[PDB]
Each structure stands twice: as C-alpha cells, then as structure tokens.
Amino acid sequence: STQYPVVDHEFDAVVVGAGGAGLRAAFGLSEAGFNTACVTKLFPTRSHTVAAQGGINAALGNMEEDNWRWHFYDTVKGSDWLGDQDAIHYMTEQAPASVVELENYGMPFSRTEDGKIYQRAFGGQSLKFGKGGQAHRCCCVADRTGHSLLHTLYGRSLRYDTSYFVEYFALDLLMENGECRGVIALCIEDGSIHRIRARNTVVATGGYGRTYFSCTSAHTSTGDGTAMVTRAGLPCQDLEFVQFHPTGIYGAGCLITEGCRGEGGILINSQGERFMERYAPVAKDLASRDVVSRSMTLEIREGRGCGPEKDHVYLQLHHLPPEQLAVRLPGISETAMIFAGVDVTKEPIPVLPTVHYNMGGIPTNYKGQVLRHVNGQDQVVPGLYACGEAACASVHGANRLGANSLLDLVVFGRACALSIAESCRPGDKVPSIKPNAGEESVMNLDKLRFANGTIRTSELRLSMQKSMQSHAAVFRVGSVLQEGCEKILRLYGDLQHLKTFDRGMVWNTDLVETLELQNLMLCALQTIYGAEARKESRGAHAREDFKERVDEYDYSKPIQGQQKKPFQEHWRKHTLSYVDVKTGKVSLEYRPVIDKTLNEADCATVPPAIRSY
Amino acid sequence: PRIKKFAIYRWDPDKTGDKPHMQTYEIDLNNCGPMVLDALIKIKNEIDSTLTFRRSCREGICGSCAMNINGGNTLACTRRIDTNLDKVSKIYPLPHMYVIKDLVPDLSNFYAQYKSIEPYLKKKDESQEGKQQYLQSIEEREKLDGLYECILCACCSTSCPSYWWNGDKYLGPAVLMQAYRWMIDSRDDFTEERLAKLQDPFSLYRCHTIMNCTGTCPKGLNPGKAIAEIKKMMATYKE
Amino acid sequence: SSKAASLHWTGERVVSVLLLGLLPAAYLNPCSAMDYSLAAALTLHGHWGIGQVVTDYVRGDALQKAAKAGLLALSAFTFAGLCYFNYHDVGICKAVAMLWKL
Amino acid sequence: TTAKEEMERFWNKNLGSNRPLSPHITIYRWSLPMAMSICHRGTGIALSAGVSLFGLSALLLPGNFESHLELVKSLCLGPTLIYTAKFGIVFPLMYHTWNGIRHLIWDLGKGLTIPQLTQSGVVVLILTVLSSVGLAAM
Numbered sequence A: 001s002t003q004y005p006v007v008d009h010e011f012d013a014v015v016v017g018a019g020g021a022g023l024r025a026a027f028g029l030s031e032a033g034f035n036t037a038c039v040t041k042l043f044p045t046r047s048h049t050v051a052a053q054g055g056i057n058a059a060l061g062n063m064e065e066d067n068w069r070w071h072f073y074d075t076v077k078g079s080d081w082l083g084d085q086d087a088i089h090y091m092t093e094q095a096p097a098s099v100v101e102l103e104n105y106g107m108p109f110s111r112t113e114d115g116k117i118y119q120r121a122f123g124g125q126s127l128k129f130g131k132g133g134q135a136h137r138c139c140c141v142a143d144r145t146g147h148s149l150l151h152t153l154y155g156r157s158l159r160y161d162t163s164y165f166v167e168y169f170a171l172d173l174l175m176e177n178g179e180c181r182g183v184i185a186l187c188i189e190d191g192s193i194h195r196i197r198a199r200n201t202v203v204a205t206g207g208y209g210r211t212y213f214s215c216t217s218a219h220t221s222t223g224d225g226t227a228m229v230t231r232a233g234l235p236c237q238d239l240e241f242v243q244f245h246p247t248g249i250y251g252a253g254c255l256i257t258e259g260c261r262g263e264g265g266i267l268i269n270s271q272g273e274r275f276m277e278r279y280a281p282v283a284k285d286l287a288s289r290d291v292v293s294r295s296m297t298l299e300i301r302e303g304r305g306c307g308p309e310k311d312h313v314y315l316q317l318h319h320l321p322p323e324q325l326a327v328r329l330p331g332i333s334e335t336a337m338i339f340a341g342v343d344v345t346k347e348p349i350p351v352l353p354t355v356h357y358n359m360g361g362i363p364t365n366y367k368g369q370v371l372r373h374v375n376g377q378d379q380v381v382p383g384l385y386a387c388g389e390a391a392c393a394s395v396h397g398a399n400r401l402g403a404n405s406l407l408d409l410v411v412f413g414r415a416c417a418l419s420i421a422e423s424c425r426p427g428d429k430v431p432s433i434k435p436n437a438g439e440e441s442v443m444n445l446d447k448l449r450f451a452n453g454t455i456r457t458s459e460l461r462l463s464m465q466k467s468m469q470s471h472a473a474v475f476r477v478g479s480v481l482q483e484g485c486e487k488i489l490r491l492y493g494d495l496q497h498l499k500t501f502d503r504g505m506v507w508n509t510d511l512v513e514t515l516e517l518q519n520l521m522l523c524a525l526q527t528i529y530g531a532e533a534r535k536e537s538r539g540a541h542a543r544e545d546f547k548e549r550v551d552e553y554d555y556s557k558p559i560q561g562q563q564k565k566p567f568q569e570h571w572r573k574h575t576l577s578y579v580d581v582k583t584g585k586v587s588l589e590y591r592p593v594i595d596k597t598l599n600e601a602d603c604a605t606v607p608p609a610i611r612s613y
Numbered sequence B: 001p002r003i004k005k006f007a008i009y010r011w012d013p014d015k016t017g018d019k020p021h022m023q024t025y026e027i028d029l030n031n032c033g034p035m036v037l038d039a040l041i042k043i044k045n046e047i048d049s050t051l052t053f054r055r056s057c058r059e060g061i062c063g064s065c066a067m068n069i070n071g072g073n074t075l076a077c078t079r080r081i082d083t084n085l086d087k088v089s090k091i092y093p094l095p096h097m098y099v100i101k102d103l104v105p106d107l108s109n110f111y112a113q114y115k116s117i118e119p120y121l122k123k124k125d126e127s128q129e130g131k132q133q134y135l136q137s138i139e140e141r142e143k144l145d146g147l148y149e150c151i152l153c154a155c156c157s158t159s160c161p162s163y164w165w166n167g168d169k170y171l172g173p174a175v176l177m178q179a180y181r182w183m184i185d186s187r188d189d190f191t192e193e194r195l196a197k198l199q200d201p202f203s204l205y206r207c208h209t210i211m212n213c214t215g216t217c218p219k220g221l222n223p224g225k226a227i228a229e230i231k232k233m234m235a236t237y238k239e
Numbered sequence C: 001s002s003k004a005a006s007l008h009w010t011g012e013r014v015v016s017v018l019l020l021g022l023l024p025a026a027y028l029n030p031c032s033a034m035d036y037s038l039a040a041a042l043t044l045h046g047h048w049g050i051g052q053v054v055t056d057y058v059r060g061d062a063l064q065k066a067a068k069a070g071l072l073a074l075s076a077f078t079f080a081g082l083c084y085f086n087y088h089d090v091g092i093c094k095a096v097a098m099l100w101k102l
Numbered sequence D: 001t002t003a004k005e006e007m008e009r010f011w012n013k014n015l016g017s018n019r020p021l022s023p024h025i026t027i028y029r030w031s032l033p034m035a036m037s038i039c040h041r042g043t044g045i046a047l048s049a050g051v052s053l054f055g056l057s058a059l060l061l062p063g064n065f066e067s068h069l070e071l072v073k074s075l076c077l078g079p080t081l082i083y084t085a086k087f088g089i090v091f092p093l094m095y096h097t098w099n100g101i102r103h104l105i106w107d108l109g110k111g112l113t114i115p116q117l118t119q120s121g122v123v124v125l126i127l128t129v130l131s132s133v134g135l136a137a138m
C-alpha cells in the first residue's frame, strides 16, 4: 500500500468510459466550458459500440411519414411495462434531434434518392401506435453503424480540451459522506495510481456480458462501473434482465444483426418451416428480441437442431438479391465467411440465441442522476451520474427494443452533460478529499498483484461463465436458479483462493483481468439472486414455474371492476440489488416503475395491456 | 491430438535489464479456436499469464489485436492458424515501434498524427448546425466507401518502410487515407486548406508507392491508392 | 500560402516523361542540340532523384545541410562536365555509338 | 493537450527510456513489390553515379574520348567479356526505365490493386530481360 506512487488530479467533471455514451458526455461537458477528464481502459475507438451493426432509431420519417410518439409507444410496449415512461418520453422526443446532430458531426449515413438518412425496418417497431404495419425508422451507416457512430463522435471530441486518460483502469468511486468526489484509477502504462477528483462524475462503462460463457459482447465488457457502485453500497437495478439476441454465430458467438431480418431475411428451423409464423403471426420473424429467442430456444428443446450436435438454428439469406446484401449488410458478409466459412448469398448462417444486452444497471433519472433507494423513496446521489448500457434509466425495462441502445448512448450522454451544465458552473469549488481516501482500492490492488493462491483466474472465470450459462439461460426455473445461486456464492468465496502470476507494474493484464473478475462476480451474483427472487414471466425473464405476467391489475380483463394489489404482492417493479462485499450476501428490495410521462398533453401514458407480437 | 508450435516475442520492462527474446508455446489445436487470438488467449489462460497483449472485440472490428503474425501485419482474431503442424507460427509486435511490454506497441504518436489532420466535418457556416440534416446524394455517399471502414489498426503505417525511417514527420497511410476521407466528403467545406496542410516534404510526400500498406490491410482496404489520389489532388487544386 | 512541395513533385514527373521521350529521340536523330538537352535532363532528374534519397535517410540537421550542399556541388560539376564533353568532344550521342561499336 | 504537444511527449518519453524497437526488416514478409522498389532505388543511385563518373572524369582526367576507347581495345576483345560488360551497363538502365513507366502509371492513379501489382511486376522483369539482351546485340 505504501509502495505505490499516488498522483492527485483536479477537475470539474470526470467521465468513466469512452464508448458512445462516454464520449457524448465527455465533449458535451467540455463544450459547456467544464474542465473534463475522460477515464477509459481502452482507446476510445476500441470501445464496444464499434461492434454495433444494426442502427440508431429516430422517427425522422425519411421513408414514409412518421411521428416520434409512435416510436414512444413501441418502446414502452417493448419494455413489457417495466420501462420508466418519463425517460422513454425524453429519449424518443430527442431521437430525431440527436441523430441529426450526429449526421451534422459527420456520420456517413446511408442515403436515399431524396438525399436523406436511410432508415430501415427493425424488430418491434410499428406505425400508428401499433396499428399501421411495419415501421421504417432505423437510421444506419450500412452495416457498420456503431463503428461510424463511435469514430465520428471521437473525431469531434478532438475539438475540445478534454483530458483523455487513455488506458487507465478505474478501480473504485471516490466517495465521502454519500457524495461522489471522483475516481481512483490504475494507470496500466506504468502501474501508478491516480486520484482524479471532480465535483461531478459520470459512469458510462457499458454492459457486463462476460458474466456468461456465450456472449456477443467484447472481452472487455465486464461491468466495472456497476461494480464500483455496488462497492459503494449503492443499489443496482433490474440486473436479472439480460437480453438474449436471437441471431449469433454458432462458433465464437459473434453477432449477425437484426438488420438481416429487417431486410427481408427469414428464420428457418430444422424441417425447413418458417417457424416464426407458428409462434408470432402479426409481426412474425421481426418481433421483440425476447419473443424470437423464446421461440428459438423452445425449438432446439424439441430436438430440431442442425449441426453435428443439433443445437442451433438457421438464418437464411439465400433468396435476397445479391446487390442488396452488398450495399446494406457488407459487415456480416465478411464475418459469416471469416468465422463460419459461409457464403451469404449461396448458404444460410448457423445462429444461436446468445447474451447480448444488459437492460439492468445503475438506477437513473431521465436526467442521468444516479438514484439511491432510501425510506422506500427515491433520492439523488450528489455528484454522480450514469448513462449508456452501464446505466438503467430503464428506457428498455424488461426488454430492449432493437436499435435503441445507440440512441440511449447519445441522448442520455447528452443529458448527463446538460444536467451538470444547468446545475453548477465551471470553476465551482471542487470538494476536498481525505488524505487516505481510496486505501481499500490500492489494498485490493496490492494483494491481487501478489496473489499466491490455489485457483487460477482463468479457471474461476470459466467456472462462473459456465455456471451462469447453465443456470440462468433463456428459460429458467426456481429449482435450477437456486442451485445456481448457491454455486455463484460458493465461487465468490474463492476470491482469496485465486492465484496470479504476473507481478510487474507496467501492463499487468493478468492483474486487470482478475480485477475484472471481481467486478464480473459482483454483477453475476446480483443477476442470479434477483432472478430467483422474481416470480413471473416479464420480458426476457421467463419463469416456467410462473408463466404469467404479474401486474397490479389483471390487465387482460376490463379495468376498474377490480381491487388494486398492494406494492407488496405484484411484480411490476424495479429490482434494487445490494451486496455486502465481505460475505457476498445479496440483500434486495424494490421500487415502482414510472408511468407518468414528461407532459401528458404532449405524450399520453400507455397503460399495461396484453403483449404478444 | 494435434500440436502446433508458437514462437512469440517477449519483453518485461520490470525485470532489471531484460533482453528481448523469443519464447515458445505448444498447444493442442483440438481444444483451441481457429484464430491466432484464440491461441494467444489459451496460452495466457493455461500456460503463461505473463503474456501481455491488446484484445477486445475478437471480431476484427475494434483493431486492438494488431501484430506481426508470420511476417505480415494483421489482426490476430481474423488470421486462422495454419493447420500444417510441421510449421511454427512466429508472432511479433508491430514493426519499428517502441515496445512497452511483449506484443504491446506504443501508438501514442500514431494517434497524435491522426489528431493533426482534424477528422471531423468543417462547415463555413456552423451557426445553423444541429437543426436540419445535411443533404448528400446517393452517389456522393459511394465515394466514402472503402474509406470510412478503416478501424485504425495501424497495420498499414507499421508496414510502410517510409514510416519506419521517418515516423516523426511522415503521417503514413492510415492517417493520410483518413485525411482523404474528409477531402472527398461532399459535406466538408475545408477541402482546399486540408490539402495546404500537406505542403511540406514529409507529411504526404514521403510515400514512394512501396504498396506494403494496401498489401497488409486486414480489412481489405486500399490506402495506397487513396494516397495516390491525394498526390493528384495536391497538384491540380487552384489558389 | 505558397505551394512549393506540390510543384516540386509535378516537376519530378515532367522531367521524367522528357527523359523517357528523349532516349528513343536521341537514338532516332543523334544531333548536337539533342546532346545538350539530354545532358540537362539527365542531371536534373538525377539531382532530384538523389535529393529524395538524402531526405529519406540523412537524419537530423547537421548532415542534412552538408548532404544537400554536397549533392548540389556534385550536380553542378556533373552538368558542366557533360556540356564540356558536348562542346569540345564528340558528345553523348556519338560517344555511345562509338562505345557500342566495340 | 494539442496534437503537436502529444508528439513532443511521445519522443521525450520513449527516447529517455529502456524500451526496445520492435524488429522491422529482420522479420517482415518479403514481397515482390517491396523488393522491386529497392531495386528501383538501387538502379537509380548506380545510374546517377555512372552519369556523374562520366561527366566528372571528362573534366578532370587528361585525354580525349577517342583515345580513351583505344586503350580499352588492346586488352583482348573477348566476345565472352565485351558482351557481358555491355550487358551489365544496359541492364540497370532497362529495369529502371521499365519500372519507371510503371511508377508514372501509378502516379496517374492506375493499376493499384494487388493483382495489378503482381501482374505488372512480372511484365517489368520480362521487358527488362528482353530489352537488355536485345540492346546488347545492336
């Protein structure tokens, strides 16, 4: 602990994360005139938004005439009424304005004949409040939308005096008296530890897909900010809600976009049946992400596989014109050939439902402010913010609508910037930190560097990943989830039993992957316990013991002829999960979803209904 | 039980005058993925965890795992291992770069050069920005194809001999191609003054059409041709 | 703003197409006026040619100033030496013809 | 931090350290284009040195050209040697000329795909061999 060089930095704002959300927040703050640091363990381009393919949602109405309130309806209906409708209002209203802003920065969107941003059909979207067929509102840069999004965002961020701490691993939040003061972080390049303190702190560290053995997300998506929050004793919301993307490569688990299915693509099983017509009649193979995967998983269970094990399904692009495949989806054309050895125009792609998105995360306003649950009521944590996948304003709720995450990144990244902007002024007193503050992080850093244990990091990571893949898959039951909970809690007790090898200062990847493992465990532990606790089939969480959707009312039959269930009995509520870091105990409580929009007269509240596409 | 040998460059800056050396790792290919990164990860996880390298997407999209595999600069998650067991794969860090540790090169100068060209739209009237979408024809969109896809892996610039001998003052294919990206984007107004920034003997003119860049590009792009396109523009533009 | 690096490059290509055109032209009709233009085109293209080799390899400033001066002196001595050969002797063209018929 | 300051801090950091440069020419994959550029430089230097040696010695050394040939006549006019001496002068010229045209085609922006480099790369070698053996017979 006393062997570590500590360099204190003084800033106005700190953004942990250089993804899409992280960047927009970062240079958005610098634009407001704030001295902003941006802490990132990767180079901004390497961040996992780069891998995004499908597109970004906006009701700009470039194909046919559209309205943003129809996009609003689709999201709340997509969220299975766990979505906070105040945040969904703000996002879908900003949707056109935020995409135009990006195009004005220099995002090379695909073009129409009219010269406008090319929009595409995507899963879950409809015209006229779910009455007028399929909606075309997915703005895209061919197949590399996330790639172009991040690059032009980074490109633009060079116009400001934003101090980028590149390849710096953030360890924990600098917290004093329930108020955020900054971040303590490891510099990977020379092993030194930096105290970057700021009046306001934005957490945008993205998802935690690496908790599972089969994910589309990068090796780096390890939910680090979500962990720094739980290590501060602050709650984590809706973590049991993990999105399983229908179409992913059978091999390494790489993504084949939902844009494939929005461009006339068909999902075909073992027999050759277009099975997404036996399950979903109205929206078909362009339904919600949780519904398609539910059909896909409950097709393999029947024994209707494909390969030498018979465990996957096919996405057929044999019928689509070759010219359309080159212009609209060149990215999956290469990766299908590279990873699966498949010609997209002559053969189908072997697909599998794999972990993709984490709609859970750090509880958030529509303003981006981190919330703590005190006295059964909501309270704003002073000087702490969260946006992107790491956050949970629950714009997505129980199931994320396709092509809405890149939107979330921009809208709330901007909102985090504006929340600080119209809150205080740059040059306001940066609160003083204690001379010792952050001992625990360095204490942890030191013992994990010299960890001469018995269980190698690799083996414990794999034990967690396989246990998560077996116990909390698409379908989950109380019997299996319980054995999972005991299994994950066991593996948490192995964190002092771990063996590390690399003992250097400069670029100790062995150390940071183990640091990632601590973070991954905390995220996994909360995901599994909340899943066994929740006794319903809402969104992507599907209990076979409790097949029904448990609301305050029975919304299938007429309203008002009923007595309202108390908050104690129904399940239309947010899961707030805590963990006592010492013993790994998951104590969890709940808060109600927001139904009121930002202005009833402008955007009517959509009450719960029967949901099936 | 198929065994493949890997000869990997190693260096530890925290080992008191440690010499740069090759270390060999032997791996069963049946318990391993097809790509080189799958092998690197396996030896990291099972054999030696002191092996330090950059990786993220394992999809050939982020550009983290750029290194010199068997002579050429490529992405490790994209180049599948040669199944021929009688051969030994030689893995090196990116040519003519300062080694921080093992297969991790210093890209600080590389990124700094990318900053100096200004990779963002520049309009003469930016007072009306953010309101309405800038119009660009479908044909003007096709001109950016082959250019935007670059992930900044730095395989090309690292393969350029001119970039070896003059890394300080020459920008290299990666950055140059991007400077060209913003030259032929119909939305950009600063096309002339972007060319005038290259009016020195080093920034652009150190290219000699050695074509190692285009040859090595893991994304299949053609930076050298785009560099030749800048040279033509530099002599043709008026005022 | 002056554009000097671009014109220099265009200059390199102009003398090249000349030197290309002049080698069959000198064979076609080996006259005295061809000998001088042949000497001028050879010496310039060689000066700019080596000029690059210098700017590519010669590191720093100390040797940079010397190598560009030493190349210039060589070039000045080379062109003057060829004109002397054209004026007082048989000239490049006739010299090749004699050397080849050997 | 500006783009210029980042570069200063790159060089100050690295040069004042014990970091090694990764191997470059020692390991890199040898290809036809890369080798054909070295030869274009090799020929360029040799030919310009040959041109200079001719002009310089015509300004310093005594005697005229007619006399200079006569002393390189009385040394056995071997058909196995005189041909070879004449072939070794015309060879670097022809290579640099043929690859020179290829450079000028490139500068116009044509033939810049890898299949177009390996095709024209052979053609340059073939046109060199034929024209060098051909002009050694005129």
Ligand SMILES: *Cc1cc2c(cc1C)nc1c(=O)[nH]c(=O)nc-1n2C[C@H](O)[C@H](O)[C@H](O)COP(=O)(O)OP(=O)(O)OC[C@H]1O[C@@H](n2cnc3c(N)ncnc32)[C@H](O)[C@@H]1O
Residues within 6 Å of the ligand: A016, A017, A018, A019, A020, A021, A022, A023, A039, A040, A041, A042, A043, A044, A046, A047, A048, A049, A050, A051, A052, A053, A054, A055, A056, A145, A146, A168, A169, A170, A171, A204, A205, A206, A207, A216, A217, A218, A221, A224, A225, A255, A356, A357, A387, A388, A389, A390, A402, A403, A404, A405, A406, A407, A409
């Ligand atoms: C996985 C995936 C997701 C995806 C997609 C395709 C794939 C394969 N396609 C999408 C699409 O077409 N349209 C869309 O709307 N979304 C799509 N997604 C989901 C979406 O891309 C992600 O949710 C989004 O990329 C998340 O972005 P965000 O800005 O929130 O964060 P990030 O991109 O993952 O970047 C994380 C950054 O945080 C830094 N970091 C992380 N931990 C630390 C610590 N330890 N210390 C310091 N910095 C840290 C990283 O450096 C990184 O920059």
Ligand code: HEM
Residues within 6 Å of the ligand: B208, C016, C017, C019, C020, C021, C023, C042, C043, C045, C046, C048, C049, C050, C052, C053, D040, D041, D044, D045, D047, D048, D051, D096, D097, D100, D101, D103, D104
């Ligand atoms: C008539 C046929 C010739 C043509 C078409 C030609 C043209 C060229 C071209 C296009 C280049 C490369 C420029 C670049 O890097 O893009 C070059 C290089 C060069 N040439 Fe020639 N040249 C010819 C003959 C000669 C001769 C006879 C000499 C000797 C005086 C010579 C001396 C040089 C030198 C010193 C270089 C520099 C090497 C380099 O930078 O790569 N060339 N020439």
Ligand SMILES: O=C(Nc1ccccc1)c1ccccc1[N+](=O)[O-]
Residues within 6 Å of the ligand: B161, B162, B163, B165, B208, B210, C056, D025, D034, D037, D038, D041
């Ligand atoms: O260095 C060059 N060749 C070379 C390449 C690899 C190893 C050794 C030499 C070369 C060749 C032609 C033009 C310009 C250069 N250059 O970069 O200075």
Ligand code: SF4
Residues within 6 Å of the ligand: B149, B150, B151, B152, B153, B154, B155, B156, B157, B173, B174, B177, B216, B217, B218, B219, B220, B221, B223
């Ligand atoms: S052009 Fe190719 S080799 Fe060069 S930086 Fe881009 S992807 Fe890498």
Ligand code: F3S
Residues within 6 Å of the ligand: B156, B159, B160, B161, B162, B163, B172, B173, B206, B207, B208, B209, B210, B211, B212, B213, B214, B223, B224, B225, B227
């Ligand atoms: S490898 Fe280098 S010389 Fe030019 S075309 Fe190429 S950048």
Ligand code: FES
Residues within 6 Å of the ligand: B054, B055, B056, B057, B058, B059, B060, B061, B062, B063, B064, B065, B066, B075, B076, B077, B078
């Ligand atoms: S690791 Fe992302 S490109 Fe190879």
